[PDB]
Structure 1
Amino acid sequence: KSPEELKGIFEKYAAKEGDPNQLSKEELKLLLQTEFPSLLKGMSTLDELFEELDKNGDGEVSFEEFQVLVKKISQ
């Protein structure tokens, strides 16, 4: 609900896989599951998100690349 929670929430998940600033498909999935399951139904599918967010040569999301979604979530 709040930004503080969401923030920590992301980490609480990012902590699981990779650094606290690193996200994972399987991870985000869950998040997008509880966090915002509607964002999943959106035109941006999991893969779409994972791929969209993951804008590098490694294969992994991060708070930064993720914030792009948050902004779209809030804005």
Structure 2
Amino acid sequence: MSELEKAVVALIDVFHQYSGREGDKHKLKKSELKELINNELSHFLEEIKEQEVVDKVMETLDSDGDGECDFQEFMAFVAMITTACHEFFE
């Protein structure tokens, strides 16, 4: 597969590596989202060390209000992070 398809595959895989840890295996709860950011986005986002930051990130990306981040909400988060990186440089 192409580099773009490898990226799509990796996005799906990372989501599940974190969503499938606890509770609803199809969504990210706060602790899963914190670990995803801290382990997988260390070059793009500041490490999260405070509950208030976890809470604010989840609040910002939880579009449907159910308290967790589903796959569509995760992809919107990825788009936001990627666009912010691009805008930093361009």
What TM-score, normalized by structure 1, do the two folds share?
A: 0.73
Stretches of 4+ moved more than 4 A in 1? none
Q: Which residue of 1 aligns with 2:69?
A: 61
Instruction: Report the structure, 1 or 2, having the larger strand content.
Output: 1
Please report the RMSD computed on the Cα atoms of aligned residues, expressed in angstroms: 2.0
Which of 55, 64, 69 is the matching residue for 1:47?
Answer: 55
Q: Is the 8 A contact 1:40 1:46 kept in 2?
A: no
Aligned length: 70
Q: What 5-or-longer segments of structure 2 have no aligned partner?
A: 1-5, 48-52, 84-90
Q: State the Cα deviation string for residues 6-60 of structure 1 (Å, max 9, x = none).
A: 320111111113132x11110010010111134246xxx4222101111234311
SS at match of 1:55: coil
**1:9 matches 2:14:** yes
CA distance in 2, matches of 1:69, 1:34: 16
Q: What 5-or-longer segments of structure 1 have no aligned partner?
A: none
Q: Which residue of 1 aligns with 2:25?
A: 19
Q: Which residue of 2 aligns with 1:32?
A: 37
